Amino acid sequence: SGAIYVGNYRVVNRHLATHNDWANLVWEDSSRDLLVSSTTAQGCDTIARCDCQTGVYYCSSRRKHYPVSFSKPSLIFVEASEYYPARYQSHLMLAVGHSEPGDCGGILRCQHGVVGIVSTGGNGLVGFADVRDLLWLDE
Numbered sequence: 001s002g003a004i005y006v007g008n009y010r011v012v013n014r015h016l017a018t019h020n021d022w023a024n025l026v027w028e029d030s031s032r033d034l035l036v037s038s039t040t041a042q043g044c045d046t047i048a049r050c051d052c053q054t055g056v057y058y059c060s061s062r063r064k065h066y067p068v069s070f071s072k073p074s075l076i077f078v079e080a081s082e083y084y085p086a087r088y089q090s091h092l093m094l095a096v097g098h099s100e101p102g103d104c105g106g107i108l109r110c111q112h113g114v115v116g117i118v119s120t121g122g123n124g125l126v127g128f129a130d131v132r133d134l135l136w137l138d139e
């Protein structure tokens with residue numbers, strides 16, 4: 001679980017969005033596993049606007065932060081789950097790191113701010129849904 005809070009927006013994994021997120025929907029993209037909803041209170045986070053390929057992510061299944069080197073946002077095949085049929089997920093970045101299904105939502109940050117959130121994983125891999133291209137989050 002986990003979310004980014006920036007301005008009057010809450011960014012979450014689309015497969016974990018609540019009834020309240022859908023009732024306050026701003027934008028969603030199943031192919032990116034992202035959903036953004038509106039909030040009344042001002043958020044706490046800053047979004048990176050960069051091309052960093054190193055950062056630190058929060059891993060809830062270890063209660064620990066880990067450093068990672070991650071690939072540029074790309075179209076990656078993701079196996080069928082209870083949430084989605086087998087498909088290509090876009091704007092996804094892969095890294096070597098520990099992750100478990102309940103780790104989705106953990107924030108990946110670089111020196112410039114929030115880069116994205118955990119969205120996929122398996123066998124010593126972790127995938128992050130990028131948010132750096134969503135320029136409208138800052139306005």
Ligand SMILES: COc1cccc(Cl)c1NC(=O)N1CCC[C@H](C(N)=O)C1
Pocket residue numbers: 015033078081083084089099100101102103104118119120121122123
């Ligand atoms: C952090 O996720 C994992 C880590 C280790 C093992 C596994 Cl099987 C996962 N589960 C996943 O990758 N997904 C299940 C939930 C939805 C995901 C998606 N974006 O399509 C895919």
Ligand SMILES: [Zn+2]
Pocket residue numbers: 048050051052110111112113
């Ligand atoms: Zn950066």
